Amino acid sequence: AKTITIKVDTFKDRKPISPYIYGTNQDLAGDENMAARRLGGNRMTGYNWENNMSNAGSDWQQSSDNYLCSNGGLTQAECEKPGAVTTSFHDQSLKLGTYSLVTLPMAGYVAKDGNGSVQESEAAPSARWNQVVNAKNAPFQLQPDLNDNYVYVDEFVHFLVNKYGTASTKAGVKGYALDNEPALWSHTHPRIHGEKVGAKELVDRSVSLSKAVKAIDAGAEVFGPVLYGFGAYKDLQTAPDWDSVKGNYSWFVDYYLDQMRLSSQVEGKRLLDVFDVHWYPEAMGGGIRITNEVGNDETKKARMQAPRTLWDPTYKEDSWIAQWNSEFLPILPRLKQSVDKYYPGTKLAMTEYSYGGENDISGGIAMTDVLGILGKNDVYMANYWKLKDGVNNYVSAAYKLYRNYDGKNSTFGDTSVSAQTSDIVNSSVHASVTNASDKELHLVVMNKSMDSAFDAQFDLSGAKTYISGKVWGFDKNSSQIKEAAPITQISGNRFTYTVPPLTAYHIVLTTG
Numbered sequence: 001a002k003t004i005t006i007k008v009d010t011f012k013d014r015k016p017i018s019p020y021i022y023g024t025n026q027d028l029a030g031d032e033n034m035a036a037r038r039l040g041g042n043r044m045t046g047y048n049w050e051n052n053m054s055n056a057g058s059d060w061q062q063s064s065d066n067y068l069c070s071n072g073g074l075t076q077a078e079c080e081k082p083g084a085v086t087t088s089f090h091d092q093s094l095k096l097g098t099y100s101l102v103t104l105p106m107a108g109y110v111a112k113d114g115n116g117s118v119q120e121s122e123a124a125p126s127a128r129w130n131q132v133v134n135a136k137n138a139p140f141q142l143q144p145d146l147n148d149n150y151v152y153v154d155e156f157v158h159f160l161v162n163k164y165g166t167a168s169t170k171a172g173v174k175g176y177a178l179d180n181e182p183a184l185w186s187h188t189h190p191r192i193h194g195e196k197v198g199a200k201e202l203v204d205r206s207v208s209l210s211k212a213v214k215a216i217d218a219g220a221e222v223f224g225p226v227l228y229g230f231g232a233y234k235d236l237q238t239a240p241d242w243d244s245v246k247g248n249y250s251w252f253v254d255y256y257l258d259q260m261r262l263s264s265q266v267e268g269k270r271l272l273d274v275f276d277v278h279w280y281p282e283a284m285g286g287g288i289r290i291t292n293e294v295g296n297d298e299t300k301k302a303r304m305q306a307p308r309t310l311w312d313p314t315y316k317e318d319s320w321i322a323q324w325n326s327e328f329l330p331i332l333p334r335l336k337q338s339v340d341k342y343y344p345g346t347k348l349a350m351t352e353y354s355y356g357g358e359n360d361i362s363g364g365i366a367m368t369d370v371l372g373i374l375g376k377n378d379v380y381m382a383n384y385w386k387l388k389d390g391v392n393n394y395v396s397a398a399y400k401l402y403r404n405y406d407g408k409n410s411t412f413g414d415t416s417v418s419a420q421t422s423d424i425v426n427s428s429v430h431a432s433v434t435n436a437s438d439k440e441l442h443l444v445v446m447n448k449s450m451d452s453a454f455d456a457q458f459d460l461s462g463a464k465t466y467i468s469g470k471v472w473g474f475d476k477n478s479s480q481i482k483e484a485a486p487i488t489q490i491s492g493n494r495f496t497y498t499v500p501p502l503t504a505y506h507i508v509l510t511t512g
């Protein structure tokens, strides 16, 4: 039998875990007890708040239609009401108690109608499109003009604030994203913005839209640039002006941060609150990218190791990013370095990601690691994106393990503390307390081996003596979170518990 040693010190490296790292785009089973929800993604670029119409772009026939009403569960009558996709979304956030991050259009046009495919020569401007104007500079209407050629973004923000109050209030919409994946506009939304976006163009569009938003709600958090992936972090997907603007910047991430900082300085107001990226691992195993399909045993093993690309300086995954751009990995410390230097005080969000294997134990184990990693690496907000339609049972299990492990919405603690393991390959472990508790200690531990159990010997440093523990977990046999055998013998703040292959447990220790 293999033994791993795990050292947990509740005094050491305490740091707040932002609850918004427990976040999603599509709602999952509904009992994950999320803290953040996003209304974002390709459909939002051309979403027209006045009539709820949007355009699929390259995802489906360049089709303008009422998909977002359908996706939101709206009736045909509700679909006709201005703002209804967004207000239905936010009403649900209020009911669930989550943050709402809402996307605003910046690519320049939105769908005028719901009448289907838009052909290449029907590209904007045309009868199929209304133009976006950031600041109306006229009296706002709660019932916007449906017959003109415009949608006014500040009018939409005024409409939300009129209904819910400002971002600083309990009921307010708190976050607005500057569109979605701008470096892919020319690929995903060729009917709206067929030219490759420029680096300077993206800053200028962003400054104009953010100013208009902040003029209505100074407390709203503006998220950008909502980058699709590493090619865009590097040079905005080969933006045509990159060589002319790049100067001494290592990557587009720095150019954007410094430019938003500079624009904010000149405007006299912060125009970027959260630096916003999407991260879909390029990590490969068994010849398959982990986000493409569950794959074979080597794909599964690579899926469970891939979260180390987020934090571990020693880990080199199999991908073109690690092959040609290793100096930018691990990615979270690299992003944080950039933000802290080029626009101090800006937060970091990963507003789409997935490690694949949605209905496989490997996808569950990967996510159990990622949620602990995000919480203790200064990520403000993170939102899973469903790459597979229908149930994603093992992704849901990972969230429930952290956020509803008992069926009563009991959670991991709000304060990360130091948890170290002797074997970073076969195990990962994350620890937390709440309000500096010396009474309850939370540990999430997992075995990534496909083959071999280990005995985890835990050594705990705390102000009081832990005397017993309850355990909940999931494994290859059941994605439901089941109660496991309790820990009844803890002597001198040490205990041992066997973790079978491909198993994740949440252990809750108590002093009383």
Ligand SMILES: OC[C@H]1CN[C@H](O)[C@@H](O)[C@@H]1O[C@@H]1O[C@H](CO)[C@@H](O)[C@H](O)[C@H]1O
Binding pocket: 040, 041, 042, 043, 044, 059, 180, 181, 278, 352, 385, 387
């Ligand atoms: O390809 C998966 C992700 C990549 N990021 C995009 O922002 C996101 O929109 C895209 O998912 C597509 O999303 C649209 C809805 O916006 C959906 O209809 C399509 O099936 C997804 O692939």
Ligand SMILES: [Ca+2]
Binding pocket: 050, 144, 145, 146, 147, 148, 149, 150, 151, 152
């Ligand atoms: Ca209008």
Ligand SMILES: [Cl-]
Binding pocket: 180, 181, 182, 183, 184, 226, 227, 228, 229, 232
């Ligand atoms: Cl992008």
